Amino acid sequence: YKKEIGMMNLEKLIQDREGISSKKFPIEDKELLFRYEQLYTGAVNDVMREFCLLEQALPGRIKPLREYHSVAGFAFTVKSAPNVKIKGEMEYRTQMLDEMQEDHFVVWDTSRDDKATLWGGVMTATAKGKKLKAACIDGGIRDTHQILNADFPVFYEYRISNGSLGRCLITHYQIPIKIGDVTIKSGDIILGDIDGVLVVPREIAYEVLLRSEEIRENEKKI
Amino acid sequence: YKKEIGMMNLEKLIQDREGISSKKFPIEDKELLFRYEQLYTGAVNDVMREFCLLEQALPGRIKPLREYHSVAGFAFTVKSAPNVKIKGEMEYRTQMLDEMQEDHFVVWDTSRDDKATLWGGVMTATAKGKKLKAACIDGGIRDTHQILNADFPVFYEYRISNGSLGRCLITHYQIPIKIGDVTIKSGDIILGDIDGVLVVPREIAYEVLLRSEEIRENEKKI
Amino acid sequence: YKKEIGMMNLEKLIQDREGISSKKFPIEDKELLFRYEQLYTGAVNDVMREFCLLEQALPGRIKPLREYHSVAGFAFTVKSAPNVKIKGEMEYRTQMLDEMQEDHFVVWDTSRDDKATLWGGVMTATAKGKKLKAACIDGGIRDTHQILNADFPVFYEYRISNGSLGRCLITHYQIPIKIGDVTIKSGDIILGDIDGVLVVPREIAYEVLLRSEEIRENEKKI
Amino acid sequence: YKKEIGMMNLEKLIQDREGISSKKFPIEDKELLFRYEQLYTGAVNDVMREFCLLEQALPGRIKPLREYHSVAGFAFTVKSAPNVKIKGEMEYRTQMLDEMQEDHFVVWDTSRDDKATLWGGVMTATAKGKKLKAACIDGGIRDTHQILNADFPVFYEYRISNGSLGRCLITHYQIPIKIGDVTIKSGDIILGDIDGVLVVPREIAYEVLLRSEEIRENEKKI
Amino acid sequence: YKKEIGMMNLEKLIQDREGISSKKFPIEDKELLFRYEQLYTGAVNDVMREFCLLEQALPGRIKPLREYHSVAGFAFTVKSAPNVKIKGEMEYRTQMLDEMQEDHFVVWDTSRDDKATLWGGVMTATAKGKKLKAACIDGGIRDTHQILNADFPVFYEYRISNGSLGRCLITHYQIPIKIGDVTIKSGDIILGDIDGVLVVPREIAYEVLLRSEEIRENEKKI
Amino acid sequence: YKKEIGMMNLEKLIQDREGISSKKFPIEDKELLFRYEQLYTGAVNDVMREFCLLEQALPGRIKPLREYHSVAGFAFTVKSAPNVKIKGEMEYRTQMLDEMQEDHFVVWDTSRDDKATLWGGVMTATAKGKKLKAACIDGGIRDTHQILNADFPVFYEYRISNGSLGRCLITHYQIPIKIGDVTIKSGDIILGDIDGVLVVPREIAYEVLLRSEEIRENEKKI
């Protein structure tokens, strides 16, 4: 069964699922992020309803470590799963850390891991030093005293003392991932605040920003 | 099959489930609420055990937005469910808002909706202006910065940025509803604090109050 | 807040979610259904992957009462939710039954009701007399001896003896509904067999049929 | 805190929860059971709705091992929970088996145990020899080849090969138990068939029987 | 079937599951606890990985009432389950309270009770007076205003106003219990902080302490 | 943080988790499997209790497609997870199929995938041609008509028509995996029947067989 794939017509599907938008914005990247941070997630969420997008929020199990005001960044996706295997990983993890840059917003698909943590004090200190914006973990975190002391926004599901080593393995990073109902791609605009994490597709990020600001200004006057 | 309903004897069931108590209290409504707010929910819960009522608390998934002291009000019930249909609703929603009065305590059955919110900044500002006591949502809330700034007690399950429009529809209000194990009827005494939300049937609300105060005074002396 | 809806641009969303396809097929309706019944659900599922549709199957909790071969029909959608209210309903239910016609495939959204049943012996006998194709209930069924004796395909979640009266209420029918990840609209082609229930959007039903038959013939020769 | 219990008025609660009905029936016990076995569980369920009883069915997770016709018996309640402790138990188990008599219907509350089984080949052979009617286990069973060969009706949740020894312990038997929404007391009439298990309180069992038979005869003529 | 147990060889299993370590430490008990309280749970968790122990943390559903720094104590295990039976209990409860001593850390297996609470204001005041270290409840708590005012560390799952009386019963205490993936025995070292509760087997508690301190000192220098 | 791993002592952990037993049996492989197929899973499960092994059964969500008698094979482990990424996989899948040999028993960890299937008609026909014994999928299957016609034992969780392509990706095979509470390694003896799937560690497989046969013979005489 290698002729079965050739019997299929998957070119349109591969482009739809694995295609990444290299679209440039009419404004600077930091200006785009700063202007998004002047909006609530609910307001941006309602705007994307007008674009017929109803499943852009991370699931309700995701909660912020503090009652944050809006923080915006560009998606850096990570994919892991519970795994008994221990060896390896350094090749994936060390290469992954080198690709994390300033203004990245980590979005981590843990394959619904409920036993271990994927983000702790070392990851937080590394992300702070690289000037990342925040991290959204669909799973466990630990070393929360160190995380709080670092003043680094973190969105998570639960907290436990079990480490990742010997319990999970990273399999991919900077690929499209799916958490809850929303698909996240590298470079998407990620917005998080007191009411969770929101995903804005990069192709409409500038248009969604202008529409959200336009709604915000009309509400004050009306 | 319209003779099947006539073949049934449902008069006793309809009165038991849909019957509303129009009982008046020997004291003023605001005095009843104020005296209930001098009691912990656990103390009132134990008293209703003596009335053979073991399922009067909202389920443990309900949590307060702040570590509230006791807040009491009269139940204003709302019923919604996830729904793809968008149009309509204004007839239900505008009529519903007009019936919300001072000292009401909103109890919202969302049909276990886990994707959208039913209570946000607009509902909170509306409830504050009408001098409602609190709101208990078996589901999602958003605009939490606005909710906290309004100093309005809110009990909820989760937080997410998805709005209700296009994801849920209100089907009924001011009818008997069931959340978890407890049935809530309009006019029931609703008590909420740091340990969740409690339902006191209106027919025994005054007797439960006197018994709870009597227990409270005997504990101090013994 | 009635100017807020006028401040929104929801025309595109309403058409996308509530729009129904009145597309006619190049073949007779019964020929379309019969040709779909010569295909497995997995084969039709793989074809819609080529259309970039990955969430067209009813959730895995849906199981067939018997190990059926493929049965196809046109979607008749029903929406209900758990409800304490008893009175009314006849207006909704009697009008609903009159609209069920030959070759309809009932798809019932129960709002994840886990306490009562929505389909029993009376509904089955009614559906058999009207020459419906099958029924898919995202919830409970009962009178299974009568259902099996009627030779009527039924897909369901669980079985329990609690009836719908006094525990649930129908709120809508023949509207778009959402069960699991898939949205079902009236007139969609519904295909069910031993491996669950599948939804084919009416707008591509004829093209999906030809592609599925083309794949089936190429597999035999290769 | 031993004066706190004396400060409470729990006599009414203890009688309501722990009181057992010693009511005799106007007919023989075996005639009562045989006449109940001529009715479907859904029909008896609807009759108890007229008695304002809406939560008399075992939860939908309970399923029959075979598509049984109606089997009726008198409730023999058992209570266990997952437990690491191994020693003891014989005092509880041997005394428990001696109290199982003819026409008993075992209803087993396992405290939602999902790791081990409470009913296997030895219990089935013991129940067959004592002429019990059936067994309803809110948990796991095993030795299913032996159970099927014994022709003994069994209602259960799941099947697994883990035994009870070293994983669970029986703590009580012949006491009131609660499974799902229904409370079961010793001597209650237990009815099970293809659509699950149903509980009829002993105090109304004869009146429910006459009403169910009356409904059944009126349906045939109308 | 009393020869079946004699046919089994369970001596090794009984010693493994019910055996309690009476090992003495080379240092004072309070010095062992104080030195453990200078470590984070994640650091001690990683050390026990070197001992091939990967399931020593309480499940992620356990959360602290406050963002505690490390608190350590010796395990006092309690086992309860939901139960309709009310009478008795005083014999178990009064004897249980007398055995709670200074520096005990209560670990309570509630058999996954989701309806009632096992720890409130009276238990907290009793534990404070006996100089217990903390309490970990795999279930509900109430009287949280009193708990917070007592400055007593509490780890829990949810909060609700339903009391234990009439809804649960204690069946055992000071026996081996299992919560989530971890087995807890009396005398085990229990460590809790902002990231949950951790179990250190008493037999390796001193060796785990020295290794954790050795790792901590090497990290500062490297 | 590459010195942190060198600061750890993980050699004992890696050998415990990733070590594979190359132990040879005193009898032929097919004789070992045939003699295991003369035993029920519950009997072998009880024997491993004497070895202090209480978590050797696959979780209760695993069910057989037919009421099988005992089938035994050597574990061939597979690991996958839900994934949006489509490309690749052939390198993993084609190499994986070449390593499947006669008398293998596939045990598939899907990372709790609830949306897609991992085993269908093509995998079944491939496994039949290679003379595999059975397949245990902790997830979805499809093409069940083809599976039943092939007379190939299959243990699974649910059935759905969604294929694996575009919804999951295989990441590892022939590594240690963990499903539920049990860890499965390549070469372990896998036993499945009407009551689920059981894992016998290869190091004790021959001793467990002799003890199980000894118990079986003593039961007939006593």
Side-chain angles (χ1 to χ4, degrees), chain A residues 3-90 92-222, chain B residues 3-90 92-222, chain C residues 3-90 92-222, chain D residues 3-90 92-222, chain E residues 3-90 92-222, chain F residues 3-90 92-222:
Chain A
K3 327 153 190 179
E4 179 183 352
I5 303 299
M7 189 180 54
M8 298 173 178
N9 302 334
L10 303 175
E11 281 175 89
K12 188 194 303 178
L13 176 66
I14 293 177
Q15 176 62 29
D16 177 42
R17 300 299 285 168
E18 297 185 358
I20 263 60
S21 176
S22 58
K23 187 176 186 178
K24 302 182 182 62
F25 310 108
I27 59 182
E28 288 293 81
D29 280 19
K30 290 186 174 300
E31 179 178 341
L32 180 78
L33 297 182
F34 178 82
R35 290 166 66 173
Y36 261 108
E37 292 174 344
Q38 314 309 314
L39 301 161
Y40 298 94
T41 51
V44 176
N45 194 296
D46 293 345
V47 161
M48 283 187 298
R49 277 206 303 240
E50 303 179 356
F51 292 78
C52 302
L53 301 181
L54 292 171
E55 300 169 347
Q56 297 301 132
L58 276 293
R61 59 179 179 263
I62 298 300
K63 53 183 181 177
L65 188 55
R66 285 290 184 265
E67 297 180 341
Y68 303 119
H69 297 276
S70 292
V71 48
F74 300 105
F76 186 96
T77 59
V78 188
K79 170 67 176 186
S80 66
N83 206 313
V84 182
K85 189 174 185 177
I86 297 170
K87 280 164 116 175
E89 186 79 328
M90 313 196 198
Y92 284 147
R93 184 174 292 270
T94 54
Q95 286 180 333
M96 182 189 69
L97 296 179
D98 296 337
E99 299 191 25
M100 295 181 177
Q101 311 292 347
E102 179 174 353
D103 290 329
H104 263 151
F105 197 140
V106 170
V107 185
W108 199 309
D109 175 20
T110 77
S111 300
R112 306 299 304 115
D113 172 46
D114 64 327
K115 305 302 181 61
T117 61
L118 281 307
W119 195 273
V122 175
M123 292 300 307
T124 298
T126 305
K128 277 287 296 188
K130 295 173 175 293
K131 291 185 173 59
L132 271 68
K133 292 308 287 289
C136 177
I137 314 295
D138 189 38
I141 65 174
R142 62 175 187 170
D143 308 329
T144 310
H145 287 300
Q146 293 80 349
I147 299 179
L148 291 169
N149 187 33
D151 193 34
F152 182 80
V154 169
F155 305 83
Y156 69 104
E157 181 184 18
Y158 65 94
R159 307 203 297 266
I160 201 177
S161 57
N162 290 335
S164 63
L165 200 285
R167 304 177 179 91
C168 299
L169 278 181
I170 299 174
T171 61
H172 308 84
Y173 62 90
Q174 289 291 67
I175 67 154
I177 59 173
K178 187 171 183 297
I179 304 177
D181 291 331
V182 60
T183 298
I184 310 100
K185 296 184 176 182
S186 297
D188 283 346
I189 276 67
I190 307 299
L191 185 65
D193 73 342
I194 192 174
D195 293 320
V197 185
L198 186 60
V199 179
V200 185
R202 187 182 186 91
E203 322 85 52
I204 65 175
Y206 185 68
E207 182 177 11
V208 167
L209 177 64
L210 301 182
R211 176 56 174 165
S212 302
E213 295 172 331
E214 165 178 273
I215 288 293
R216 177 192 61 193
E217 302 306 312
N218 297 339
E219 290 181 346
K220 305 172 184 176
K221 307 170 185 178
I222 283 80
Chain B
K3 327 153 190 179
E4 179 183 352
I5 303 299
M7 189 180 54
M8 298 173 178
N9 302 334
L10 303 175
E11 281 175 89
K12 188 194 303 178
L13 176 66
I14 293 177
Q15 176 62 29
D16 177 42
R17 300 299 285 168
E18 297 185 358
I20 263 60
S21 176
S22 58
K23 187 176 186 178
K24 302 182 182 62
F25 310 108
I27 59 182
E28 288 293 81
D29 280 19
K30 290 186 174 300
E31 179 178 341
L32 180 78
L33 297 182
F34 178 82
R35 290 166 66 173
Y36 261 108
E37 292 174 344
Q38 314 309 314
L39 301 161
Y40 298 94
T41 51
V44 176
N45 194 296
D46 293 345
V47 161
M48 283 187 298
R49 277 206 303 240
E50 303 179 356
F51 292 78
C52 302
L53 301 181
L54 292 171
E55 300 169 347
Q56 297 301 132
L58 276 293
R61 59 179 179 263
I62 298 300
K63 53 183 181 177
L65 188 55
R66 285 290 184 265
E67 297 180 341
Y68 303 119
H69 297 276
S70 292
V71 48
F74 300 105
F76 186 96
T77 59
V78 188
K79 170 67 176 186
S80 66
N83 206 312
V84 182
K85 189 174 185 177
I86 297 170
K87 280 164 116 175
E89 186 79 328
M90 313 196 198
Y92 284 147
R93 184 174 292 270
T94 54
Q95 286 180 333
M96 182 189 69
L97 296 179
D98 296 337
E99 299 191 25
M100 295 181 177
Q101 311 292 347
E102 179 174 353
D103 290 329
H104 263 151
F105 197 140
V106 170
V107 185
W108 199 309
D109 175 20
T110 77
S111 300
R112 306 299 304 115
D113 172 46
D114 64 327
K115 305 302 181 61
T117 61
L118 281 307
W119 195 273
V122 175
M123 292 300 307
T124 298
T126 305
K128 277 287 296 188
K130 295 173 175 293
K131 291 185 173 59
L132 271 68
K133 292 308 287 289
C136 177
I137 314 295
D138 189 38
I141 65 174
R142 62 175 187 170
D143 308 329
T144 310
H145 287 300
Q146 293 80 349
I147 299 179
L148 291 169
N149 187 33
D151 193 34
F152 182 80
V154 169
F155 305 83
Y156 69 104
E157 181 184 18
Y158 65 94
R159 307 203 297 266
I160 201 177
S161 57
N162 290 335
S164 63
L165 200 285
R167 304 177 179 91
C168 299
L169 278 181
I170 299 174
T171 61
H172 308 84
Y173 62 90
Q174 289 291 67
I175 67 154
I177 59 173
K178 187 171 183 297
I179 304 177
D181 291 331
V182 60
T183 298
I184 310 100
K185 296 184 176 182
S186 297
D188 283 346
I189 276 67
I190 307 299
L191 185 65
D193 73 342
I194 192 174
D195 293 320
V197 185
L198 186 60
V199 179
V200 185
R202 187 182 186 91
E203 322 85 52
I204 65 175
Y206 185 68
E207 182 177 11
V208 167
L209 177 64
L210 301 182
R211 176 56 174 165
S212 302
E213 295 172 331
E214 165 178 273
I215 288 293
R216 177 192 61 193
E217 302 306 312
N218 297 339
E219 290 181 346
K220 305 172 184 176
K221 307 170 185 178
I222 283 80
Chain C
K3 327 153 190 179
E4 179 183 352
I5 303 299
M7 189 180 54
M8 298 173 178
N9 302 334
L10 303 175
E11 281 175 89
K12 188 194 303 178
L13 176 66
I14 293 177
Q15 176 62 29
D16 177 42
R17 300 299 285 168
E18 297 185 358
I20 263 60
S21 176
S22 58
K23 187 176 186 178
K24 302 182 182 62
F25 310 108
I27 59 182
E28 288 293 81
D29 280 19
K30 290 186 174 300
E31 179 178 341
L32 180 78
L33 297 182
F34 178 82
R35 290 166 66 173
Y36 261 108
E37 292 174 344
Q38 314 309 314
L39 301 161
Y40 298 94
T41 51
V44 176
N45 194 296
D46 293 345
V47 161
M48 283 187 298
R49 277 206 303 240
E50 303 179 356
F51 292 78
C52 302
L53 301 181
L54 292 171
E55 300 169 347
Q56 297 301 132
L58 276 293
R61 59 179 179 263
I62 298 300
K63 53 183 181 177
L65 188 55
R66 285 290 184 265
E67 297 180 341
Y68 303 119
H69 297 276
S70 292
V71 48
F74 300 105
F76 186 96
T77 59
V78 188
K79 170 67 176 186
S80 66
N83 206 312
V84 182
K85 189 174 185 177
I86 297 170
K87 280 164 116 175
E89 186 79 328
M90 313 196 198
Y92 284 147
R93 184 174 292 270
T94 54
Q95 286 180 333
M96 182 189 69
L97 296 179
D98 296 337
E99 299 191 25
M100 295 181 177
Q101 311 292 347
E102 179 174 353
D103 290 329
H104 263 151
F105 197 140
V106 170
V107 185
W108 199 309
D109 175 20
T110 77
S111 300
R112 306 299 304 115
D113 172 46
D114 64 327
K115 305 302 181 61
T117 61
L118 281 307
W119 195 273
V122 175
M123 292 300 307
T124 298
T126 305
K128 277 287 296 188
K130 295 173 175 293
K131 291 185 173 59
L132 271 68
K133 292 308 287 289
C136 177
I137 314 295
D138 189 38
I141 65 174
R142 62 175 187 170
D143 308 329
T144 310
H145 287 300
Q146 293 80 349
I147 299 179
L148 291 169
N149 187 33
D151 193 34
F152 182 80
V154 169
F155 305 83
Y156 69 104
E157 181 184 18
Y158 65 94
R159 307 203 297 266
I160 201 177
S161 57
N162 290 335
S164 63
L165 200 285
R167 304 177 179 91
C168 299
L169 278 181
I170 299 174
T171 61
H172 308 84
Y173 62 90
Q174 289 291 67
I175 67 154
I177 59 173
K178 187 171 183 297
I179 304 177
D181 291 331
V182 60
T183 298
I184 310 100
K185 296 184 176 182
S186 297
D188 283 346
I189 276 67
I190 307 299
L191 185 65
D193 73 342
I194 192 174
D195 293 320
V197 185
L198 186 60
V199 179
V200 185
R202 187 182 186 91
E203 322 85 52
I204 65 175
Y206 185 68
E207 182 177 11
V208 167
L209 177 64
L210 301 182
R211 176 56 174 165
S212 302
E213 295 172 331
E214 165 178 273
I215 288 293
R216 177 192 61 193
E217 302 306 312
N218 297 339
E219 290 181 346
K220 305 172 184 176
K221 307 170 185 178
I222 283 80
Chain D
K3 327 153 190 179
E4 179 183 352
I5 303 299
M7 189 180 54
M8 298 173 178
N9 302 334
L10 303 175
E11 281 175 89
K12 188 194 303 178
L13 176 66
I14 293 177
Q15 176 62 29
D16 177 42
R17 300 299 285 168
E18 297 185 358
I20 263 60
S21 176
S22 58
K23 187 176 186 178
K24 302 182 182 62
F25 310 108
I27 59 182
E28 288 293 81
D29 280 19
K30 290 186 174 300
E31 179 178 341
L32 180 78
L33 297 182
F34 178 82
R35 290 166 66 173
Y36 261 108
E37 292 174 344
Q38 314 309 314
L39 301 161
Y40 298 94
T41 51
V44 176
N45 194 296
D46 293 345
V47 161
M48 283 187 298
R49 277 206 303 240
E50 303 179 356
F51 292 78
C52 302
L53 301 181
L54 292 171
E55 300 169 347
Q56 297 301 132
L58 276 293
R61 59 179 179 263
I62 298 300
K63 53 183 181 177
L65 188 55
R66 285 290 184 265
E67 297 180 341
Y68 303 119
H69 297 276
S70 292
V71 48
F74 300 105
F76 186 96
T77 59
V78 188
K79 170 67 176 186
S80 66
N83 206 313
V84 182
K85 189 174 185 177
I86 297 170
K87 280 164 116 175
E89 186 79 328
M90 313 196 198
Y92 284 147
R93 184 174 292 270
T94 54
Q95 286 180 333
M96 182 189 69
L97 296 179
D98 296 337
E99 299 191 25
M100 295 181 177
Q101 311 292 347
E102 179 174 353
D103 290 329
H104 263 151
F105 197 140
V106 170
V107 185
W108 199 309
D109 175 20
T110 77
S111 300
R112 306 299 304 115
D113 172 46
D114 64 327
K115 305 302 181 61
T117 61
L118 281 307
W119 195 273
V122 175
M123 292 300 307
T124 298
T126 305
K128 277 287 296 188
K130 295 173 175 293
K131 291 185 173 59
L132 271 68
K133 292 308 287 289
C136 177
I137 314 295
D138 189 38
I141 65 174
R142 62 175 187 170
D143 308 329
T144 310
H145 287 300
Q146 293 80 349
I147 299 179
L148 291 169
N149 187 33
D151 193 34
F152 182 80
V154 169
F155 305 83
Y156 69 104
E157 181 184 18
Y158 65 94
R159 307 203 297 266
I160 201 177
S161 57
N162 290 335
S164 63
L165 200 285
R167 304 177 179 91
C168 299
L169 278 181
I170 299 174
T171 61
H172 308 84
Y173 62 90
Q174 289 291 67
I175 67 154
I177 59 173
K178 187 171 183 297
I179 304 177
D181 291 331
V182 60
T183 298
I184 310 100
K185 296 184 176 182
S186 297
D188 283 346
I189 276 67
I190 307 299
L191 185 65
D193 73 342
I194 192 174
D195 293 320
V197 185
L198 186 60
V199 179
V200 185
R202 187 182 186 91
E203 322 85 52
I204 65 175
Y206 185 68
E207 182 177 11
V208 167
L209 177 64
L210 301 182
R211 176 56 174 165
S212 302
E213 295 172 331
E214 165 178 273
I215 288 293
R216 177 192 61 193
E217 302 306 312
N218 297 339
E219 290 181 346
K220 305 172 184 176
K221 307 170 185 178
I222 283 80
Chain E
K3 327 153 190 179
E4 179 183 352
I5 303 299
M7 189 180 54
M8 298 173 178
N9 302 334
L10 303 175
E11 281 175 89
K12 188 194 303 178
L13 176 66
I14 293 177
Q15 176 62 29
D16 177 42
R17 300 299 285 168
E18 297 185 358
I20 263 60
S21 176
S22 58
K23 187 176 186 178
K24 302 182 182 62
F25 310 108
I27 59 182
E28 288 293 81
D29 280 19
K30 290 186 174 300
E31 179 178 341
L32 180 78
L33 297 182
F34 178 82
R35 290 166 66 173
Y36 261 108
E37 292 174 344
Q38 314 309 314
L39 301 161
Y40 298 94
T41 51
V44 176
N45 194 296
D46 293 345
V47 161
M48 283 187 298
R49 277 206 303 240
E50 303 179 356
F51 292 78
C52 302
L53 301 181
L54 292 171
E55 300 169 347
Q56 297 301 132
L58 276 293
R61 59 179 179 263
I62 298 300
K63 53 183 181 177
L65 188 55
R66 285 290 184 265
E67 297 180 341
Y68 303 119
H69 297 276
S70 292
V71 48
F74 300 105
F76 186 96
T77 59
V78 188
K79 170 67 176 186
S80 66
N83 206 312
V84 182
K85 189 174 185 177
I86 297 170
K87 280 164 116 175
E89 186 79 328
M90 313 196 198
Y92 284 147
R93 184 174 292 270
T94 54
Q95 286 180 333
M96 182 189 69
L97 296 179
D98 296 337
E99 299 191 25
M100 295 181 177
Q101 311 292 347
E102 179 174 353
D103 290 329
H104 263 151
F105 197 140
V106 170
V107 185
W108 199 309
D109 175 20
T110 77
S111 300
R112 306 299 304 115
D113 172 46
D114 64 327
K115 305 302 181 61
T117 61
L118 281 307
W119 195 273
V122 175
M123 292 300 307
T124 298
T126 305
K128 277 287 296 188
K130 295 173 175 293
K131 291 185 173 59
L132 271 68
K133 292 308 287 289
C136 177
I137 314 295
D138 189 38
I141 65 174
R142 62 175 187 170
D143 308 329
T144 310
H145 287 300
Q146 293 80 349
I147 299 179
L148 291 169
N149 187 33
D151 193 34
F152 182 80
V154 169
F155 305 83
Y156 69 104
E157 181 184 18
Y158 65 94
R159 307 203 297 266
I160 201 177
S161 57
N162 290 335
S164 63
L165 200 285
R167 304 177 179 91
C168 299
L169 278 181
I170 299 174
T171 61
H172 308 84
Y173 62 90
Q174 289 291 67
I175 67 154
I177 59 173
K178 187 171 183 297
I179 304 177
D181 291 331
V182 60
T183 298
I184 310 100
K185 296 184 176 182
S186 297
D188 283 346
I189 276 67
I190 307 299
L191 185 65
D193 73 342
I194 192 174
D195 293 320
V197 185
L198 186 60
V199 179
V200 185
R202 187 182 186 91
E203 322 85 52
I204 65 175
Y206 185 68
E207 182 177 11
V208 167
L209 177 64
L210 301 182
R211 176 56 174 165
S212 302
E213 295 172 331
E214 165 178 273
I215 288 293
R216 177 192 61 193
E217 302 306 312
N218 297 339
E219 290 181 346
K220 305 172 184 176
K221 307 170 185 178
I222 283 80
Chain F
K3 327 153 190 179
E4 179 183 352
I5 303 299
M7 189 180 54
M8 298 173 178
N9 302 334
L10 303 175
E11 281 175 89
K12 188 194 303 178
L13 176 66
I14 293 177
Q15 176 62 29
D16 177 42
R17 300 299 285 168
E18 297 185 358
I20 263 60
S21 176
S22 58
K23 187 176 186 178
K24 302 182 182 62
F25 310 108
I27 59 182
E28 288 293 81
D29 280 19
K30 290 186 174 300
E31 179 178 341
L32 180 78
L33 297 182
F34 178 82
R35 290 166 66 173
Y36 261 108
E37 292 174 344
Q38 314 309 314
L39 301 161
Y40 298 94
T41 51
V44 176
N45 194 296
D46 293 345
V47 161
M48 283 187 298
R49 277 206 303 240
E50 303 179 356
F51 292 78
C52 302
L53 301 181
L54 292 171
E55 300 169 347
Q56 297 301 132
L58 276 293
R61 59 179 179 263
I62 298 300
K63 53 183 181 177
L65 188 55
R66 285 290 184 265
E67 297 180 341
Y68 303 119
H69 297 276
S70 292
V71 48
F74 300 105
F76 186 96
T77 59
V78 188
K79 170 67 176 186
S80 66
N83 206 312
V84 182
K85 189 174 185 177
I86 297 170
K87 280 164 116 175
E89 186 79 328
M90 313 196 198
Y92 284 147
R93 184 174 292 270
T94 54
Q95 286 180 333
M96 182 189 69
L97 296 179
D98 296 337
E99 299 191 25
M100 295 181 177
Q101 311 292 347
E102 179 174 353
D103 290 329
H104 263 151
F105 197 140
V106 170
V107 185
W108 199 309
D109 175 20
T110 77
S111 300
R112 306 299 304 115
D113 172 46
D114 64 327
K115 305 302 181 61
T117 61
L118 281 307
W119 195 273
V122 175
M123 292 300 307
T124 298
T126 305
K128 277 287 296 188
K130 295 173 175 293
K131 291 185 173 59
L132 271 68
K133 292 308 287 289
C136 177
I137 314 295
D138 189 38
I141 65 174
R142 62 175 187 170
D143 308 329
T144 310
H145 287 300
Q146 293 80 349
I147 299 179
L148 291 169
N149 187 33
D151 193 34
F152 182 80
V154 169
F155 305 83
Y156 69 104
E157 181 184 18
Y158 65 94
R159 307 203 297 266
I160 201 177
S161 57
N162 290 335
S164 63
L165 200 285
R167 304 177 179 91
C168 299
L169 278 181
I170 299 174
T171 61
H172 308 84
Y173 62 90
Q174 289 291 67
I175 67 154
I177 59 173
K178 187 171 183 297
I179 304 177
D181 291 331
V182 60
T183 298
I184 310 100
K185 296 184 176 182
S186 297
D188 283 346
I189 276 67
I190 307 299
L191 185 65
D193 73 342
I194 192 174
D195 293 320
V197 185
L198 186 60
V199 179
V200 185
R202 187 182 186 91
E203 322 85 52
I204 65 175
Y206 185 68
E207 182 177 11
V208 167
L209 177 64
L210 301 182
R211 176 56 174 165
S212 302
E213 295 172 331
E214 165 178 273
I215 288 293
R216 177 192 61 193
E217 302 306 312
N218 297 339
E219 290 181 346
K220 305 172 184 176
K221 307 170 185 178
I222 283 80

